[PDB]
Amino acid sequence: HWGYGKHNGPEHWHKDFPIAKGERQSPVDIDTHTAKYDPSLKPLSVSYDQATSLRILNNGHAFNVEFDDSQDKAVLKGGPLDGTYRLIQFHFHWGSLDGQGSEHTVDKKKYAAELHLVHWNTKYGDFGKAVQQPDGLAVLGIFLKVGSAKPGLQKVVDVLDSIKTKGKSADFTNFDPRGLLPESLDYWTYPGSLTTPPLLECVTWIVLKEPISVSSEQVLKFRKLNFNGEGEPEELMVDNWRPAQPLKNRQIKASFK
Ligand SMILES: CCc1ccc(S(N)(=O)=O)cc1
Ligand SMILES: OC[C@H]1O[C@@H](O)[C@H](O)[C@@H](O)[C@@H]1O
Ligand SMILES: [Zn+2]
């Protein structure tokens, strides 16, 4: 199956997922000079006060922190979005070294990692139906740079020892994703896709301009996870990022003048 190695990584994905060469693939490089301020964007609303996290899972590609999405609690609205999008999970992409790891780039700059908060459009009822729609998903992307520790990330870091290998999960209740945001909600937005197979072209991307800082020790613990399952040869979970894809017939809009 697909992965990030030489033999199953991004350059191979198109053989089983031909949309990999599609017209609205993600991630992309964000050329900050070409992105245009858009006065039609409404204020962005990140409403996570009632978020209910449930579990953390090593799925062999990354780790997902999963939320109860059976009611409107943690939701994303406004900005480029029509209607209400419900938080289902977050995960990260990261590198083997601090100089790489993000999926989106900013004027070709790669960050050490990138956080994706994944939401589905409630008009479609369930995530599965949403990924059959052009406006089914909204992903809030946040860059990570290495510097001071992010206190709100530490609970995630400290559970990773218990989900080292593919298929392991652990209870992860009462985690507040508000502790992963930066101060500013300035953002860029464009229409794109999932960045892993099945690469479906359903996503409104909202990428925050301000990175969060995490400590070297925090990101080093991400890099101790394993792609492999228990009992199998150790393959460190690093460099689980897809590189930038062709922008094709798209424009990136900025929320800020
Ligand atoms: C199908 C699950 C899924 C959800 C979100 C992503 S991503 N990396 O946020 O585009 C990829 C895959
Ligand atoms: O035709 C002019 C229009 O061109 C579009 O490509 C831009 O997105 C708009 O902001 C602009 O007003
Ligand atoms: Zn992602």
Please enumerate, by residue number, every residue annotated as part of a binding site for substrate.
195-196
- CA 6: distance to chain centroid? 22
* Contact of 143 with 106, CB cutoff 8 Å: yes
| Gap from CA of 194 to ligand 1 centroid (Å) | 5
Q: What is the whole-number distance in angstroms between the Cα of residue 117 and the centre of ligand 1?
A: 9
**Domain extent for 77:** 1-257
Number of domains present in the structure of the chain: 1
What is the spatial distance between Cα 140 and Cα 244, in angstroms, rounded to a whole number?
17
CA 40 / ligand 1 centre spacing (Å): 27
Which residues make beta-bridge pairs with 66?
Answer: 55, 89
Annotated binding site for Zn(2+): 91, 93, 116
Q: What distance in Å separates the CA atoms of residue 20 and residue 160, rounded to the nearest whole number? A: 31
CA distances from 176 to 49, 52, 90, 116 (A): 8, 8, 12, 15
Query: What spatial distance separates the first Cα and last Cα of the chain, rounded to whole Å?
Result: 44
Residues sharing a CB contact under 8 Å with residue 83, sequence separation 6 or more, in sequence order: 77, 121, 122, 123
Q: Which atom of ligand 2 is nearest to the CA of 253?
A: 8
> What is the total residue count of the chain?
257
- CB-side exposure of 133: number of CA atoms within 13 Å? 16
Q: What approach was used to elucidate this structure? A: X-ray
Give the DSSP letter of residue 244.
P
Q: Which residues have a catalytic role annotated?
A: 61
Place of tokens 């994944």: 118
